[PDB]
Design a protein around this motif. Structure first.
Motif, short mmCIF file in Angstrom:
data_model
loop_
_atom_site.label_atom_id
_atom_site.label_comp_id
_atom_site.label_asym_id
_atom_site.label_seq_id
_atom_site.Cartn_x
_atom_site.Cartn_y
_atom_site.Cartn_z
N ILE A 119 44.24 128.46 36.37
CA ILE A 119 43.83 128.12 37.73
C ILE A 119 42.61 127.21 37.69
O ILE A 119 41.87 127.10 38.67
N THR A 120 42.39 126.55 36.55
CA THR A 120 41.27 125.64 36.40
C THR A 120 41.54 124.71 35.23
O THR A 120 41.96 125.16 34.16
N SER A 121 41.31 123.41 35.44
CA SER A 121 41.53 122.44 34.37
C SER A 121 40.58 122.65 33.20
O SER A 121 40.92 122.28 32.07
N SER A 137 39.96 139.50 42.57
CA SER A 137 40.00 138.99 41.21
C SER A 137 38.74 139.40 40.47
O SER A 137 37.63 139.36 41.02
N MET A 156 32.29 144.98 50.66
CA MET A 156 32.84 143.65 50.38
C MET A 156 31.73 142.67 50.05
O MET A 156 31.83 141.89 49.09
N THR A 157 30.65 142.68 50.83
CA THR A 157 29.53 141.80 50.56
C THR A 157 28.89 142.11 49.22
O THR A 157 28.49 141.20 48.48
N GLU A 212 43.93 140.54 38.49
CA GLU A 212 44.12 140.36 39.92
C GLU A 212 44.83 141.57 40.51
O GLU A 212 45.80 142.07 39.95
N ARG A 219 49.04 144.52 50.69
CA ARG A 219 49.06 144.25 52.12
C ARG A 219 48.75 145.53 52.88
O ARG A 219 49.41 146.56 52.67
N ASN A 234 31.06 140.67 46.54
CA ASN A 234 30.96 139.22 46.49
C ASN A 234 29.65 138.78 45.84
O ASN A 234 29.64 137.83 45.05
N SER A 261 40.79 137.96 51.80
CA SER A 261 41.91 138.46 52.58
C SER A 261 42.26 137.45 53.66
O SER A 261 41.38 136.78 54.21
N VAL A 262 43.55 137.35 53.95
CA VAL A 262 44.06 136.51 55.03
C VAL A 262 45.14 137.29 55.75
O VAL A 262 45.99 137.93 55.12
N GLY A 263 45.11 137.25 57.08
CA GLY A 263 46.02 138.08 57.86
C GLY A 263 45.73 139.55 57.66
O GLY A 263 44.71 140.06 58.13
N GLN A 264 46.62 140.24 56.95
CA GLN A 264 46.39 141.62 56.55
C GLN A 264 46.78 141.81 55.09
O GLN A 264 47.33 142.85 54.71
N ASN A 265 46.51 140.81 54.26
CA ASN A 265 46.78 140.87 52.84
C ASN A 265 45.48 140.68 52.08
O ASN A 265 44.75 139.71 52.33
N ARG A 310 41.35 136.70 33.69
CA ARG A 310 41.17 137.41 34.94
C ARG A 310 42.15 138.56 35.06
O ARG A 310 43.17 138.63 34.37
#
Lengths: 140, 208, 151, 59, 173, 137, 151
Positions: free
Chosen positions: G128-130, G40, G20-21, G144, G148, G24, G32-36, G142
């Motif tokens: 997702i960006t102006s 991207s 993961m690092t 994506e 989960r 990144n 990830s948040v929770g288990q999801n 992108r």
């Protein structure tokens, strides 16, 4: 650059886990039973009419009781400076109420204890006479 | 019948005048009496005078003050913004407005009533606001030193007082949040002996 | 006998008298008559001027009072608040009630060994001394807790 | 038709009903479906009718 | 000096104590102050605390454990964890123009109306605190949901624990 | 400076789930009982009220069990009021019991009537200082 | 222990966080948040310009992303393709759809473990960006991947 989801807590217990697992289902069953009971039977009246509140009564209380009701109500009336009256005779079976709450009105305390007593006991208050009377049901 | 401006200790009386919008500019003891429904949006009193209007039903109106008049108004007005910086003394009989933004600086004595969807008030010093009999959905109160305001919020209340500030809520809101900095105080002072006054519940039992 | 309780849990009369003496020397009034105990605290040492706001440092005194109370066995604890005449009767009564509510709530949150807690305020109706030159500094404004030792 | 108060001033008030028809109520005035107002209250929301009915704020 | 209860809603002079203790040097004080006031240190200390920070695309989001930062089963707000809120304010001061959205989330047990009311109450309280933190009310909008959309399942103890939360979104322009 | 957290508080997820379930079931049972309960307004509450007669404001301490008419006659005689009965005596009598120390005569009679229930009623008359015990048919 | 698997086969949380690092720091977004879990990838670093074709060097990145995905248990994986407004709407939708289909096909061919693979492309329907200056260079172009992790 580390990663951490928010909720970090103390270690738990498997037995408590199982207890909660059963308890949530029990609560679900109770909720659906309450729903069906409400939908089948139309409520009609509120105990506010038979006992409202007045002055020198908004004083507040937080209690935890697991016993009979007569002495508790007597202490309530003693705090409220109101006379205490009994009607009928207590049955051979003691009447016990377990109630745990925190910082509500004394009037609402009376309302909830009367509701929880339900059939066996009834409560009335005469503010003009500053009296609180509890009556046992006449049954059998 | 479009714009009237008077100064200099004059008495005028009128009734049964009809208009869409007129501009009123009164000063220096304008003893003005109205006994009709007048459509207008811009009124300006310089100050230090008495003025009364009996019946205005306008879509909008805006008013500011500089002196110290004594104003009493009856009718229905959808007002939005108001600031006071002198020794204002105002009474409004009825208002049907969604957004209210009130600022008071030096001395204010405001008696209002009606229906409000959203209201916010800023008080700096020596301002008394008797917003009782006026019901609102969203209330925001910000008070600095020596400011007394009584409010009658119904659903959502946010209140902050710095010091020597009094916030008197005369209703049981569904949700309420209050904060004091140095000596601010938020008090209920309800009937306290009411026959059928509801008490706190789980959603709203917010301990000060 | 060893399986039987030798003494009440966490009980030491020496500690009890030491802590109550400490309270008295700090200035908090402690009175014991028969077996009913009264404890009085000045408002100026607890709150800000005529406000239901809590002084941050007062949490130490609150914790000490709670610890002392833990040493006793009771049934009901009664809390009363009293103030000085500032605006009306209603404002003062509401302020006293609010102070009683907040202190009682903190006590109940703490590990108080109670069964019943009563709270009320009386504003500036019952003085204790005609000397009222000061306001919130005057000793008449106070918070009182009364309780009867069980058995 | 049922009616519920909206706001109170000493002496007279402003009222709404089930049909959304606004009304201005005097201390002494006739109220449809309720009769005539005998007394209003400002500190309390109760207002009294000739028929003995009492009107309060809407829930 | 400082006062634990939010310092009476006044931004403190974080630099003056640092420069005083350094002089007791000015240059090292300045560099230490700017380093420890850099946004990166803010985010790192948030991660050290019980805070979740997310930045992606242009919108930025914050996740707060309601259970940790609230009195249990009550709209009452915890006070012991004040530094989290202080750092929250310090970070949020960097974006004095973005519109803000705040939402609440709770678990799947209880009355649906009860859950919705509790979520709404929590959102109201949080947005009230934000407003009292000096932000004009025009920039705030609050909402609360129950089990409408869960990032974690409720059948698992720890997942259900993670489910209840406070969400904060804000754009950039 | 020294602020404490709650001691017996749900610091664990299992604990909070348990307490939440407890709150839920408590509320559910509360409203269940509220639906169940039946109440009556004072307007139709057929109970003997207070005769509000000074001569009946005396003080006595009395304990008794058994029949009712004789006890009522004794009470009326102590109250210096005439006593009369209207009806017949059922073969199985009406029995009651009451022990008290401080309960004035009026509320004593009210309790007597309440315990007697619907088989009989009692009525007071301060115009002519009398008490009537009416049976049921 | 030799009979019952003490842990899921070929798993190591240290390896998980390491990869993961590495992703990144390579710049591909992983979160990830929770288990999801959601990842991207910019379109420029994967495809050629305005074409539904895979750059040859990108096969190593696909291989290692599949290797990372192999460290999870899942059921459904969803892939979406978003691009920039170039000529029309239909052409861009077709390009995104083809890209998503190709990447999903290669992932399924590789040793991934899933029961359902969903793929869809939209184009420039929701940025997702102006900032909308660049075309394929713009970060909003992108791909994506979302799923989960259950139990």
């Amino acid at each position: 650059m580390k990663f951490k989801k928010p909720p970090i807590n103390n270690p738990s217990d498997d037995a408590t886990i199982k207890l909660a697992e059963a308890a949530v289902s029990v609560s679900d069953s109770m909720l659906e039973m309450a729903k069906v009971e409400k939908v089948i039977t139309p409520p009609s009246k509120d105990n506010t009419l038979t006992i409202p509140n007045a002055y020198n009564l908004q004083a507040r209380a937080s209690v935890d009781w697991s016993g009979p009701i007569e002495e508790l109500t007597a202490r309530i009336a003693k705090a409220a400076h109101f006379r205490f009256r009994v009607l009928g005779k207590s049955p051979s079976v003691p009447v016990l109420i377990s109630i745990s709450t925190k910082d509500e009105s004394l009037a609402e305390i009376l309302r909830d204890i009367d509701y929880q007593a339900g059939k066996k006991a009834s409560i009335h208050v005469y503010p003009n006479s500053q009296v609180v009377e509890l009556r046992y049901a006449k049954i059998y | 019948l479009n714009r009237f401006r008077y100064e200099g200790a004059g008495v005028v009386t009128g009734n049964n005048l009809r208009t869409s919008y007129l501009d009123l500019y009164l000063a220096n003891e304008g003893t003005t009496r109205l006994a009709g429904n007048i459509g207008l949006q811009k009124l300006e009193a310089v100050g230090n005078g008495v003025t009364q209007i009996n019946g205005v039903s306008s879509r909008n109106l805006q008013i500011v003050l500089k002196g110290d008049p004594k104003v009493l108004i009856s009718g229905f007005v959808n007002l939005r913004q108001l600031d006071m910086y002198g020794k204002g003394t105002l009474s409004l009989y009825w208002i049907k407005s969604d957004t209210l933004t009130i600022r008071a600086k030096k001395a204010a004595k405001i008696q209002l009533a009606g229906i409000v969807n959203r209201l916010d008030v800023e008080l700096w010093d020596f301002a008394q606001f008797k917003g009782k009999y006026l019901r609102a959905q969203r209330s925001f109160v910000k008070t600095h030193d020596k400011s007394v305001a009584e409010i009658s919020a119904v659903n959502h209340q946010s209140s902050l007082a710095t010091d020597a500030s009094d916030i008197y809520y005369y209703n049981l809101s569904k949700t309420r949040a209050d904060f004091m900095a140095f000596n601010g105080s938020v008090l209920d002072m309800r009937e306290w002996g009411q026959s059928d006054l509801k008490d706190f519940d789980r959603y709203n039992k917010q301990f000060p | 006998v060893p399986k039987l309780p030798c003494r009440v849990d966490g009980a030491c009369d020496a500690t009890i008298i030491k802590m109550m003496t400490d309270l008295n020397k700090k200035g908090i009034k402690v009175a014991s008559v028969g077996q009913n105990y009264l404890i009085s605290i000045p408002a100026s040492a607890l709150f800000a001027d005529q406000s239901p706001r809590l002084n941050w440092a007062s949490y130490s005194l609150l914790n000490e009072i709670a610890a002392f109370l833990k040493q006793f066995r009771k049934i009901a604890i009664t809390v009363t608040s009293y103030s000085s005449k500032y605006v009306s009767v209603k404002r003062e009564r509401a302020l006293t009630l609010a102070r009683s509510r907040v202190v009682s709530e903190y006590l109940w949150s703490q590990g108080v060994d109670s069964r019943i807690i009563f709270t009320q305020g009386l504003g500036s109706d019952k003085p204790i001394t005609s000397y009222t030159l000061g306001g919130d500094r005057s000793p008449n404004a106070r918070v009182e807790i009364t309780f009867r030792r069980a058995v | 038709i049922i009616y519920y108060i909206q706001a109170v001033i000493p002496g007279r008030a402003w009222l709404i009903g089930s049909n959304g028809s606004t009304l201005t109520v005097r201390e002494g005035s006739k109220i449809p479906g309720y009769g005539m107002v005998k007394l209003i209250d400002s500190l309390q929301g109760r207002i009294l009718t000739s028929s003995g009915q009492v009107i309060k704020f809407s829930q | 000096c400082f006062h634990p209860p939010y310092n009476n809603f006044q931004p403190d002079r974080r630099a003056v104590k640092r420069v005083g203790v350094d002089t007791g040097g000015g240059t090292v004080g300045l560099v230490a102050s700017i380093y420890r006031d850099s946004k990166r240190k803010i985010i790192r200390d948030l991660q050290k605390q019980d805070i979740q920070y997310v930045e992606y695309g242009d919108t930025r989001t914050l996740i707060i454990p309601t259970d940790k930062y609230f009195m249990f089963s009550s709209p009452r707000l915890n006070e012991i964890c004040y530094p989290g809120l202080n750092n929250v304010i310090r970070l949020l001061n960097f974006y004095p123009q973005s519109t803000i959205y705040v939402a609440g989330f709770t678990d799947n047990v209880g009355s649906r109306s009860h859950k919705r009311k509790l979520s709404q109450a929590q959102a109201e309280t949080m947005m009230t605190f934000l407003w009292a933190n000096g932000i004009a009310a025009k920039r705030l909008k609050a909402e609360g949901y129950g089990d409408k959309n869960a990032i974690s399942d409720n059948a698992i103890i720890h997942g259900s624990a993670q489910n209840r939360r406070i969400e904060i979104q804000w754009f950039t322009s």
